């Protein structure tokens, strides 16, 4: 009965990078989280501000969905109170977050014959990111006290690099797709409920 759209979110053709993640607002549908086809590559499941057992008995106003692709040894940075490079320059969660974090292996799609270069991530920045902020600036970074004048040199670098995903690798370098859900509840006629 007018199920929520989750087919194109979890079964898309190609995802985006981590510095340009997408954001889709789901509303006016019934939360029916039982048709995720079990996410065959053994998806993980961790919720912080909600309980997995009894969560279908709560009506929320709006539910946001974010999607990106990161490495294997960096999935632990998507959590409240975490430091690093993908938790301070690309994507950061607040201290009181209500939602769940999902991730599964995608080593059979995001890999081609001897080298795949189509995913980037920010390495240099001036200050840390506030929660829920996206930056798509491709300017040059100054690491000294002299102007750069828009040309790479000694103390002026480029803030983006590739990932080099390859099929033959370890269990800590294969790509993992991450989807973050956030629940919202305010003084509105909430319509997004569970199966009931």
């Amino acid at each position: 009965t007018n199920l929520c759209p989750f087919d194109e979110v979890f079964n898309a053709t190609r995802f985006a990078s981590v510095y340009a993640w997408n954001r889709k607002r789901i509303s006016n549908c019934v939360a029916d989280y039982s048709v995720l086809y079990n996410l065959a590559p053994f998806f993980t499941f961790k919720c912080y501000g909600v309980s997995p057992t009894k969560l279908n008995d709560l009506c929320f106003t709006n539910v946001y969905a974010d999607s990106f692709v990161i490495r294997g040894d960096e999935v632990r940075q998507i959590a409240p109170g975490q430091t690093g490079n993908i938790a301070d320059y690309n994507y950061k969660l607040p201290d009181d977050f209500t939602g769940c974090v999902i991730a599964w292996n995608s080593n059979k799609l995001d890999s081609k014959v001897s080298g795949n270069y189509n995913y980037l991530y920010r390495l240099f920045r001036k200050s840390n990111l506030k929660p829920f902020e996206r930056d798509i600036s491709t300017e040059i970074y100054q690491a000294g006290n002299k102007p750069c004048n828009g040309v790479a040199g000694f103390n002026c670098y480029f803030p983006l690099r590739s990932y080099s995903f390859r099929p033959t690798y370890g269990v800590g370098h294969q790509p993992y797709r991450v989807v973050v859900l956030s629940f919202e509840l305010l003084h509105a006629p909430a319509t997004v409920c569970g199966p009931k």
Partner: antibody, heavy 123, light 109 residues
Framework: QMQLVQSGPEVRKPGTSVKVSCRAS????????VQWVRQARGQPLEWIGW????????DYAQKFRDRVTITGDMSTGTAYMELSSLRSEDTAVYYC????????????????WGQGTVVTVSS | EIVLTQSPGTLSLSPGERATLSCRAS???????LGWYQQKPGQAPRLLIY???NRATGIPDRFRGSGSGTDFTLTISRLEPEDFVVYYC?????????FGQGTKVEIKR
Amino acid sequence: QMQLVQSGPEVRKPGTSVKVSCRASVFSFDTSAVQWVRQARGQPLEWIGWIVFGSSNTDYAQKFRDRVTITGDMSTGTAYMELSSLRSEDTAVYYCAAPHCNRTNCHDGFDIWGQGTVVTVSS
Amino acid sequence: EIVLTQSPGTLSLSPGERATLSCRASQSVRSGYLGWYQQKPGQAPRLLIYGAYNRATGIPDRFRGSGSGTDFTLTISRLEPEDFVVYYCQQYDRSPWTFGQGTKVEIKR
């Protein structure tokens, strides 16, 4: 005092591989850089041979870039330099240089230097 | 590649005087990526002037930097003899970085 420790002397045959290291503590900040210079007896300095730890990007000279390679490692903080197909004209001292850098900002000039490494090619 | 040509090969003076050495270039370089060095024979070179205007830490207040555009010069204030050594210039602005030939200073007698 902030200094850069280097390797010891080594003698090689006419045509082989050689490896010289340059270990330091400031080489683990994702923004550090280090160049390689060479000075013979009497002759002045030679080249640049620089590398940036992080977004690894090499840039060699014209006579080189056919027999030299530079690598980096942030775990131990040690740089490396390899030179294959050695002839009897490379007998000189090799130096290591790097600027003082924080985790977010570097300096504006090469301040710290090294000691030197002697390479000889004979019997 | 940009080439540097230091004109004064040797420059003999007396302790307690003023010497002026220059290090010109062929093309035009940016006055933000020039550096001077000092090297004693049998030791490791150190940094003297970076940015062609700024001095390094610990360097005494007698080495003054000047010059811009295509011609750069280094002036000595008072020769208290501890610095009769070779000086070099470097231009780390383009992709191929080069050095100079060398200027040695000796004592006159």
